[PDB]
Amino acid sequence: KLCSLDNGDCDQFCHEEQNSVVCSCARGYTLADNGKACIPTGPYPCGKQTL
Amino acid sequence: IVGGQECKDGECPWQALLINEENEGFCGGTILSEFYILTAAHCLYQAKRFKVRVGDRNTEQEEGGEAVHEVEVVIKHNRFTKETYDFDIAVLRLKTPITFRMNVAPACLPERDWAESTLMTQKTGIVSGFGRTHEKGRQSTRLKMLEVPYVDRNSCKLSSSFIITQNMFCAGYDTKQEDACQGDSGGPHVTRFKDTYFVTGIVSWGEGCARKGKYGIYTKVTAFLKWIDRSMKTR
Numbered sequence A: 001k002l003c004s005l006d007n008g009d010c011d012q013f014c015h016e017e018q019n020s021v022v023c024s025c026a027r028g029y030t031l032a033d034n035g036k037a038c039i040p041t042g043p044y045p046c047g048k049q050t051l
Numbered sequence B: 001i002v003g004g005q006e007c008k009d010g011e012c013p014w015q016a017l018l019i020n021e022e023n024e025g026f027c028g029g030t031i032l033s034e035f036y037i038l039t040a041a042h043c044l045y046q047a048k049r050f051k052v053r054v055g056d057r058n059t060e061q062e063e064g065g066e067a068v069h070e071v072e073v074v075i076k077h078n079r080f081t082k083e084t085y086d087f088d089i090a091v092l093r094l095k096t097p098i099t100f101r102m103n104v105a106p107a108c109l110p111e112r113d114w115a116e117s118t119l120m121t122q123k124t125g126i127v128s129g130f131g132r133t134h135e136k137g138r139q140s141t142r143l144k145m146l147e148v149p150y151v152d153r154n155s156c157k158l159s160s161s162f163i164i165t166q167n168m169f170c171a172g173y174d175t176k177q178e179d180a181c182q183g184d185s186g187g188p189h190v191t192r193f194k195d196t197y198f199v200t201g202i203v204s205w206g207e208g209c210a211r212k213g214k215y216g217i218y219t220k221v222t223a224f225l226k227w228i229d230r231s232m233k234t235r
C-alpha cells in the first residue's frame, strides 16, 4: 500500500483502496495489464509533448 | 514572461492564445480537449470580441501549424470578483473542434486528491505565454515557458499585499528575475510528472513582474476540478 512510497508505482493517479493501492489514468488513456501503467488510446494523448 | 527558455517545437503544445479584434494577443489559455479551452476569468473583459488561436509559437513567421477558432459560448465562474480575483477561472467552448497536431495537443486534467499530494508538492511547475519580457516592456513575438518552483503558502500570504484565497497559490521567486507578467493571464500552469503534464493552475495575478519579495499568484485548478467537469458539459 501507501501511494507515498513512489506514487504507489503508478504512471498516474493513485488511491489506497482500503488495504492496498489502485492505479488509474487520465481520459484518453487505459490502464495497462499490470494495473500500474498508462497507455494512450489515441494519437494525440493529453499531457504528451508533440514530437 | 521574464526569463525562462523558448518553447521549442512541440514543447508547449497545450498553450492557447486569446486574440482581439486587432488580432493582438492579450491573454493565454489551455487546451483541455478538442472543444474546450481553460482560461482565467478576468481575461474575459479585455475584449468586446475575441478568438482563441492555438498552435502558434512565433507571431510573425507563419509556422503553418497555427489555427484560429471562434468561441461558441463562454462560461465565466459565477463567483468571480474583479475586486479580489477570487474564482479567477473560466472555460471557453469552441464552435469547431481543435485538430490535434504538432505544437497542438490537449494537456491532462488530474484528480483533486492525487494532484494536491503528488502534483503540487512537486519542486517546480511550468508556466508559459506571449506576455511581456520585462515588467514594463512590450508583449512577445516568441512563445515562452518558465519553470516556476512552488512557493510556501505562508510566505506566500505574508509577502502579498492582498488576500490569498482558497482558490489561489503562489509560485516563482523572491529575488530571481523570473515570473509571468502582463498578457500571461489565463495562461497554463502545468506540472510535469513522468513525461506527462497536468493542468495544475491558471495564471491569475501578481504585484508587478519579478519584483523582489513578491510572487506570482495562480488559480488553484485542483480546487475547481468538479467545476471544469460540470463545465465541459456546458453550464
Ligand SMILES: O=C1CN(S(=O)(=O)c2ccc3cc(Cl)ccc3c2)CCN1CC1(CO)CCN(c2ccncc2)CC1
Pocket: B083, B084, B085, B162, B163, B179, B180, B181, B182, B183, B184, B185, B203, B204, B205, B206, B207, B208, B209, B210, B215, B216, B217, B218
Ligand atoms: O492588475 C494588475 C496586472 N499586472 S500584470 O499585467 O503585470 C500581471 C498579470 C498577471 C500575473 C500573473 C503571475 Cl503568476 C505573475 C505576475 C503577473 C503580472 C500587475 C499589477 N496589477 C494590479 C493589482 C495589484 O498588484 C493586481 C491584483 N489585485 C488584487 C486585489 C485583491 N485581492 C487579490 C488581488 C489588485 C490590482
Ligand SMILES: [Ca+2]
Pocket: B056, B057, B058, B059, B060, B061, B062, B063, B064, B066
Ligand atoms: Ca505564426
